[PDB]
Amino acid sequence: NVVLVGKKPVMNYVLAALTLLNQGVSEITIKARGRAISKAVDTVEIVRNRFLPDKIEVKEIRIGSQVVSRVSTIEIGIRKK
């Protein structure tokens, strides 16, 4: 129950997240690395503020690194209220 945010338009990942939520998945994690990290935050904010206002909480946010080169990563856990 993970949406990996990559290079595609942000609405791709917004719709992927809503699809899971509408399937009865109440907790999903949005993940990204490198420059896509800002698009992962966009994805969550669009889902939280524009689609499901007052029904999505941000449960936790983790940042880290991975070797490839070091690249940064983010993981954002969201939950239905």
Added chain:
Amino acid sequence: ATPSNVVLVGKKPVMNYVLAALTLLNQGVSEITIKARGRAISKAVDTVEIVRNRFLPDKIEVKEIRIGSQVVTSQDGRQSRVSTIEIGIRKK
């Protein structure tokens, strides 16, 4: 974090903000906040990760991360929304 102890990460090279963060930490500031908006959000994460992987491994804790949105006015007068991140870090 008092207002002097926020590093607002923007358009400059990432080592500029790494240097700002290390300077505050070296001066004894216990708590700092790394903030950014829009595409600089990924550079803000980079800043924290470079600090704690390349310079001060095992000395920096991430106290809390908050994300949100801001309303930005462009030069032509339109308003749109930009994402935000705030990363509180502290030593020990």
